[PDB]
Amino acid sequence: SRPQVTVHSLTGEATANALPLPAVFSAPIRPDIVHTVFTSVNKNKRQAYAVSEKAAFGNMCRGGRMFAPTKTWRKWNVKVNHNEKRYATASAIAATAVASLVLARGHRVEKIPEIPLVVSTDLESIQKTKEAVAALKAVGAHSDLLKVLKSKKLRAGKGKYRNRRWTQRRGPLVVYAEDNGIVKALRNVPGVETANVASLNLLQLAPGAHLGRFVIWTEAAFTKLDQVWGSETVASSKVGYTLPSHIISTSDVTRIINSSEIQSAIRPAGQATQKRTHVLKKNPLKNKQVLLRLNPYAKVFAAEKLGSKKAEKT
Amino acid sequence: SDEIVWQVINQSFCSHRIKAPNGQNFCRNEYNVTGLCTRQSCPLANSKYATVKCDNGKLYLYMKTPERAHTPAKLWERIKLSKNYTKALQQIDEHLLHWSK
Amino acid sequence: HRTAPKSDNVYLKLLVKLYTFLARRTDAPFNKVVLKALFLSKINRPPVSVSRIARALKQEGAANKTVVVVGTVTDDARIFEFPKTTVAALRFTAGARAKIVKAGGECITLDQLAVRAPKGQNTLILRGPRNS
RNA sequence: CAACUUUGGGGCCGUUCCUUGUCUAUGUUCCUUGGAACAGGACGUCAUAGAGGGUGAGAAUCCCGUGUGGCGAGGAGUGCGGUUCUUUGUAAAGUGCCUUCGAAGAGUCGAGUUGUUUUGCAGCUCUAAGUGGGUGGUAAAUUCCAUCUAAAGCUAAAUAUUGGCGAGAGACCGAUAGCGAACAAGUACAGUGAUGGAAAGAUGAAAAGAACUUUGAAAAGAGAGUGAAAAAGUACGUGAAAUUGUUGAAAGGGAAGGGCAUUUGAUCAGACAUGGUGUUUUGUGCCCUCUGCUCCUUGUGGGUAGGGGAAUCUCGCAU
RNA sequence: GGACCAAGGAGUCUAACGUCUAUGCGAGUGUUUGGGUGUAAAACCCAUACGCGUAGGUUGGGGCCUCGCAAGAGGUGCACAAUCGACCGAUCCUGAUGUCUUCGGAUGGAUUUGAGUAAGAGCAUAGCUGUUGGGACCCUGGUUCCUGCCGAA
RNA sequence: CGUGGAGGUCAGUGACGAAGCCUAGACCGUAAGGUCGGGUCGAACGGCCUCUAGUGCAGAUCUUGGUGGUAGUAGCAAAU
Ligand SMILES: [Zn+2]
Structure with missing residues (x-):
């Protein structure tokens, strides 16, 4: 959530220039939507397959026709809502900044200058x-x-x-x-x-529907990301598209819970594990200690021995 | 973002996480103090973090601050631990002053 | 019915964790209502038009109340005059969001709502009119 | 009438197209294992080449390729691009204005019937018009308006393609699957015929396919040998079950099986366990002291050198 | 119904409506016929159309507020329900002002009416499922893993 | 729980032996099943998060293949 990112040289060092975040990294990260979009997008580059048309007669038989001859007109490509696909790409782009996610996928990024890693545009001119x-x-x-x-x-x-x-x-x-x-x-x-900023392939973005592939940016591409997705300042360059909103503003719930004012408004807490009371029943009429946690008259009852008391001769 | 990162790591693929026959989980995260992959355990899901870890001979306390969430090369701070066992535990309690239990 | 959201929106489950901490640790029935409303389906969360919100603000003593919608606040161009008030909800269509902002009001998320009213002080909850 | 405006045909060389041919990077560096390194480790180089395949096991760098470009060769050809040779003869055409004219699909249209189709088509009979005819709306109605020219013809492209000739792919099947057919499969075979129609893949890296001796009609052996492996012998990768033979053990005597629980018999498993705490001896070092160097995340930091000392202290280590 | 054993072997696919759930957007929604683009059956961008939808009171009452130590009291009242309304359309009478001699509906009634007004909720994708049809579980017989929970006639 | 294939990941395992087979060997699972030892074997294969299905057999006088008893019996062109 820092404002800006230091660009790095091809020799690799903090170039004095820095670039503001394109606010795409503030997008909501929705791995459910990334997953549901990713399945359908991964179903796109598929070639159909089929058994022969007519080529005993039993599914159980050797050499017979099989049960359910696999036909071509089973659905191969899957239609996806365009805003939903763009939403999945936006969540992937926002996830690439974080780099706890990039380590969580598995990358060797422990010695890199910063995140998101931005190199000069001169990188493009290498042939x-x-x-x-x-x-x-x-x-x-x-x-x-x-x-x-x-x-x-x-x-x-x-x-x-x-x-x-x-x-x-x-x-x-x-x-x-x-x-x-x-x-x-x-x-x-x-x-x-490699990827132009215009395309930004989701399959290249979150491979296996796992968010946060290690992504290197060139300097002009990082500026161009504002052109590609827009902001609250730059429009979108996509027709009627908006970078979508959050339903919750603060990403940390435990910060909200432990803030001050919820911590003011809230009753005191328990032991955070229950103190077991009466783990086992001790019967009275024996075990005279538990007889004495009940009925304190029982002590003077035994002291006077009223169970064996002699009545008057009247 | 830490709870979002945690629920991604938990409910989806933590690459370091290993599943036992018992059902219990184990991060292969090299900075993870306990072997487990739990909410407190993943160094990826927590920005304040610490770890006793040995480089070839000498043992170092490794500190992780939220201040350096970016720049992961400059992320870990290193402290040389004393060879006196008591002194090094005292050093731990010093550098983890006002820190969680 | 549901004791959990059948959705898998992560942010929704975050709000469920927050309001279940509230609905355990508060004594107001408000957060219990909010928790039970968070479990509802898309059919059981009908959208609330901003016209219906303004017609609700025509109630007596409600002008300094805040309004809460577990659901989506949708716009309607059939109204012109909308009061300056504070609306908290799950989702805001950009038309209704511009109606609230353009009327000088405030578009609030439910986390900020919990921060402002942990016990549900001085609130209103509106439900969309379900037919089918 | 007034002007304007225009010229066609060759050649050749390129280009374009096709069919080809050829050239165009970088380890076979050390160690281990292995029958064989293409495996593992260490150190490398190329890359517009880390597709793929082969080479005695997972080969970018061994080979072919791959990638990038280059040089050819033989055709096709007017597609155009230059040159070059000619092409006129009152030749051909176009535009505006004026004048004079200003010709088109008949056994067809249509009508009836029959069949057929769901209105066309076909047959039979009849069979037209020329400000004509076809078709459709329209009405304030002795209607108006619309819109085409039938009965002659050609026409690329966008289209279909389970065939042909080729390519390139696959979230397909992996030898009872996939084509009937991975194999000398429409084969062997069957049927008089029309037709029907199988089964059948794997030695090994290399046949190095078992020299020689001997039994043996001959088939098969036994010695011997090759091979990393015949626990790979042309019955051959691996080699399950059903079932068979021998030996051992036990039980049975016209005995059937399991479940529980226990003995007996047989049998197996059963530390590379061997330490901790305190004290003491001596020695050593990131221990002590002095003198440095260096990285930034610049701090409660990190690395690192030289000499001295344990004579005293102290830590760790060793003892 | 069975000599044994191995392998193979039986609810698949598609279309049309339907519920539920999830997701995006929201009175709108739907990129992928097609065009542009490309590292090339992927991804990326999208013009014009089109599709489907859109175009009052009382009683309560979730809560919320106030007061009350609490118990409770008062107020505002979500959704929804009942009542009394109103209006629109219909319903059958009234048949005016006018009236071309048959035109006209003015006003007042009456019951019900209606997914009616009285301030929207849908579109698209996916999943699971209901009905129907395509050979449609396979050939009367058969119909392939476990555990837990509910469990009739 | 198991099976074929697919995306991601474990810089997963593997000629010092993968997969498969056997296992009067041990272990964990309530079970579906899983893990290891040993033997055999020679070249690929697994765990996890997801996707996908030609995905689970004892029967159907099921299909195909193999092998029994019948039985050294019937019997001697039952095929030669
Ligand atoms: Zn983890």
């Missing part, structure tokens, strides 16, 4: 792979890249021999305002994926 990799070394995302590079494993499924042989983790995401050969330079290094 060779080794220079851009050395630039990310100078940033400090080297450990994330080494994680991705070590993480190349072979797929456990049958889909290994369905052209999906290798698998590995995902790494940094570089956001540029404009290509100047950067997307060719980072194409060869694994785990890195």
